[PDB]
Ligand binder design. Sequence first.
Ligand SMILES: O=C(O)c1ccccc1Nc1cccc(C(F)(F)F)c1
Ligand SMILES: O=C(O)c1ccccc1Nc1cccc(C(F)(F)F)c1
Lengths: 115, 116
Amino acid sequence: CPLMVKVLDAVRGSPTINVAVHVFRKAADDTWEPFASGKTSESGELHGLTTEEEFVEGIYKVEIDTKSYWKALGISPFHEHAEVVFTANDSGPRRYTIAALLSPYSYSTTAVVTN
Amino acid sequence: CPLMVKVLDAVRGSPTINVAVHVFRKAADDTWEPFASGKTSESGELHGLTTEEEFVEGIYKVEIDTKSYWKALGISPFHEHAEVVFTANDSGPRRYTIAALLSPYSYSTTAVVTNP
Ligand SMILES: O=C(O)c1ccccc1Nc1cccc(C(F)(F)F)c1
Ligand SMILES: O=C(O)c1ccccc1Nc1cccc(C(F)(F)F)c1
């Protein structure tokens, strides 16, 4: 589909399995409208969030429930969550993969945007 | 100085100067109230945002205006901003350094937490 989320664990060297991901679209009044959500698979991936026809131009937020993940492993986390906010655009590439690499006190996020 | 923000440019290998940073604290009614704001210096650091008295227990949001930084260099970046949300002082007062490393399509953020 046009949007995919992938999550990795930098402590155990593994995909992060069963972590909650919420997607939002910015409304005209500047509040975040909930859009789609799911849990990452055994491969740390979340597919099928939206479709080409639903995923119009606009500003989107992806929120990964990183705190619940670290709590499940018995490790004290710093962040409440990891959030990515971006403008989706009709001119350039259209397939978005949002990747996040997770540590208890640090995260990195990258977008891979293709054709 | 219980809260400091430090920002680095991963393309040029330099501190990022004059980057806007806005800090918010979660209120009892669950809204974000304006806490402090500032811009990074020559060294890419922002000191003096708050005091040990003012910086009580709570959930804080730090929003770094990364988009304006890149657009001022001619670059249309992926992210609208970099935002760090965290519980502070839950086991007593600490000193927090929030660091962000910036690329047009990526950022990494870390916290260094020390006991004064
Ligand atoms: O590992 C994948 O398959 C991956 C895919 C898309 C985007 C990023 C991906 N990995 C990823 C994600 C975050 C940080 C790093 C690392 F810095 F380790 F290379 C690698
Ligand atoms: O660069 C500093 O002096 C620094 C200070 C405090 C916390 C982190 C700090 N540095 C930091 C922050 C994010 C990513 C990286 C890197 F990955 F490049 F090593 C280094």
